């Protein structure tokens, strides 16, 4: 199936909230991050589709990045998400 369908089928809330709490918060968070990796892993090709999954997390939280600065910060956290889940950062992935 397409990455379009694979990513939309998943619940990215734990991933988006995990990132938001760190950037906007400059235990529950290991279970929230653990649930994040569980949701990514449910994708049939989770290593492929990782770019789309990160782009969808960013698209989902964009309205809440009220600042020129918050957007850099969200991006670094996002970019570190794949390694946190024992995947590799994707290769042609523009998060802007």
């Amino acid at each position, epitope marked *: 199936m*397409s990455c*379009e369908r694979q*990513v*939309d089928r998943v619940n*990215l*809330k734990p991933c988006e909230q995990h990132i938001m709490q760190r950037i906007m918060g400059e235990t529950r968070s290991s279970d929230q991050q653990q649930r994040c990796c569980d949701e990514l892993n449910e994708m049939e090709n989770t290593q492929g589709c990782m770019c789309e999954a990160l782009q969808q997390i960013m*698209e989902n939280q964009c309205d809440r990045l009220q600042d020129r600065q918050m957007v850099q910060q969200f991006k670094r956290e996002l970019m570190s998400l794949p390694q946190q889940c024992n995947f590799r950062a994707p290769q042609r992935c523009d998060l802007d």
Partner: T-cell receptor
Amino acid sequence: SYELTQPPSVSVSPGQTASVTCSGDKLGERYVSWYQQKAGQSPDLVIYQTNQRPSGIPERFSGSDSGNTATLTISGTQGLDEADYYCLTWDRGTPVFGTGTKVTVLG
Amino acid sequence: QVQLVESGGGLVKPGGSLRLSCVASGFTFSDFYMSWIRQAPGKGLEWVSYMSATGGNIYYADSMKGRLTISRDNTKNSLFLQMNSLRADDTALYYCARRKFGAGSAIFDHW
């Protein structure tokens, strides 16, 4: 598969806060969306992303969640807020609407 | 301001076909999932179908499985729903709606 329960009706006096609660298995781990529908009219989105997020919607509308429940809460209900309210969540690509909750404003 | 103008409803004989259409204005239509939702008068909201902006993601509701085709022509800001083998328990209010996010956040933000 995934199921959402809502109280069929909820009554509030003018000025009190009304609470509409939506229940599902570990619903707190998902986003909840809320929709208001007055009779003869199309639904209106009043809260999104598990009720912490509004829109160009009145400030008295707010959302929260806890465990297996999500809650639309209307502070200072005004009678024009009399409507049906529906919660929405998603399950592996399937949109799941709650059964309606009918909010009545007494007085 | 977003606007979704719906047409193609009315009386239809059982077993017949019906093509619903929605013309959008006020946003770049080609950036959004679009959907169809229905509601029998006095009942709750029941989803019917949605599709990606231009994609392989098309979902149909089990209630109508195998009896409807969704499509869109983005050059004309238009969404379509073809309904086949209609039955008496299919009469209802049909809504066109825009979907806004995904992967757990999708919302029907304009109806």
